[PDB]
Design a protein around this ligand. Sequence first.
Ligand SMILES: Nc1nc2c(ncn2[C@@H]2O[C@H](COP(=O)(O)OP(=O)(O)NP(=O)(O)O)[C@@H](O)[C@H]2O)c(=O)[nH]1
Ligand SMILES: *Cc1c(O)ccc2ccc(-c3ccco3)cc12
Ligand SMILES: [Mg+2]
Lengths: 310, 164
Amino acid sequence: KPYEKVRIYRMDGSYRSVELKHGNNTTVQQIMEGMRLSQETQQYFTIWICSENLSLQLKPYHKPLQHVRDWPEILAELTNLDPQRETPQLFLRRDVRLPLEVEKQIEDPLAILILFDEARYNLLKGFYTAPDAKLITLASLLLQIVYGNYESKKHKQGFLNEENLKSIVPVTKLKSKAPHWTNRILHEYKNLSTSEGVSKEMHHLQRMFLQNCWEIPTYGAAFFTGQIFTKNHKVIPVYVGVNIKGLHLLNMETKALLISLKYGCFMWQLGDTDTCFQIHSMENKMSFIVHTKQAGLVVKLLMKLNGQLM
Amino acid sequence: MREYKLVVLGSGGVGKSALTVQFVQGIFVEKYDPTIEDSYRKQVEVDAQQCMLEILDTAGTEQMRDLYMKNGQGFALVYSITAQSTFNDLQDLREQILRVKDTDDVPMILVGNKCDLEDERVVGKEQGQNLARQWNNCAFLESSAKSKINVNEIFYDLVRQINR
Ligand SMILES: Nc1nc2c(ncn2[C@@H]2O[C@H](COP(=O)(O)OP(=O)(O)NP(=O)(O)O)[C@@H](O)[C@H]2O)c(=O)[nH]1
Ligand SMILES: *Cc1c(O)ccc2ccc(-c3ccco3)cc12
Ligand SMILES: [Mg+2]
């Protein structure tokens, strides 16, 4: 073939090969045009570059293959990792700046499906902290979406083991809280199928799944890695989630929600040597400091997402 | 959960992407965008067991065709009942697959697409059955991505042919 190409993956493992009309000088915007997307679908998504431990949203003017070429230097600036075990790939993902009010008016079936796969991926990974009731509802919708209608001859007993459970509940709960949710999951699953008041069209069911995900505090969040010190002093690895709602802190080991702060209920300050940033939570008389080489990006994203709010 | 690697082959325009997108995403791609190489993933239930399908949607021409054959487990051979040339091209593809797999026991299915355009039909249903008969009683199906006719059966039958 007399042309260059690149794979653009999605969270579900699928990919789409696009032509590279300008080689490594092709931009995100030119690649975005190379997909099977309309201007309707394109406004909700953008190209990300992600390895195992670093995910970066790119901009229309960015040249993604030069980011691939420069990945070991980028990992050295932003992480404390060895660049060898990290090869990046390009992904089509939700725009982190996409306001929730705009997502709530989406009707395109393809856009709904792409947003649904990302949300399901973040759920099973354990990044979406929700009460046990919200998680059971999401698991029953996944059963309807993936396994079709409920049938007592098939799903009543000896079906929701752990291999099937792993695909509908967060991995952080599969061992502890999940094996006691099975009866409550099937009852909602049974209720979803035998109910004409609920549309079983595929884009409608996925739209329902996303509705229950929109109330989750960490929905649509871009995640960064960092470190906090216990108030004798013990290091706690953390995920720093920054979305259109605010800022959230996850225990890196167990994904437990440490603190979640809506915009306008806290203030931020970038550290001196950049290696950190401070969060003063007003109306609580409490502050904390997060150490991370990505602290510059966290603060820069916090300003843009806060400035977006009216 | 067993994984199945299926490859959709055929000349350009026959609806390889339309059949795949309809099966995986339930959407009918009305536009025409010549494919470079697309890979889809989908979990289905074939004969009361959960399967994981990786479906490779290939280009009409161009070229890496031998890599697809050596790695693929089942092959959907697609033509359009609207274009005779797309029907004739399938004999070379059938022989290429047998040559690379070095056998005739290859999971395979012949798919005549665009049966919703019954008016503009050029290839007959009996001539398609006659080809599949010649091909060691190969499976045969007439399908339509627009009307969602025989779409799910194309990939379900390839899964059963791999389980044997
Ligand atoms: N009426 C009708 N049109 C169809 C059907 N299947 C595909 N088409 C149309 O045929 C055109 C080509 O379809 P496409 O899926 O891209 O075929 P392809 O085999 O993937 N082409 P390529 O090999 O170049 O990638 C599109 O305009 C599509 O809408 C069908 O069952 N009925
Ligand atoms: C840096 C930046 C600006 O200036 C505007 C909008 C942005 C949106 C998303 C990011 C980001 C997500 C992960 C890493 O960076 C940055 C960004
Ligand atoms: Mg195609």
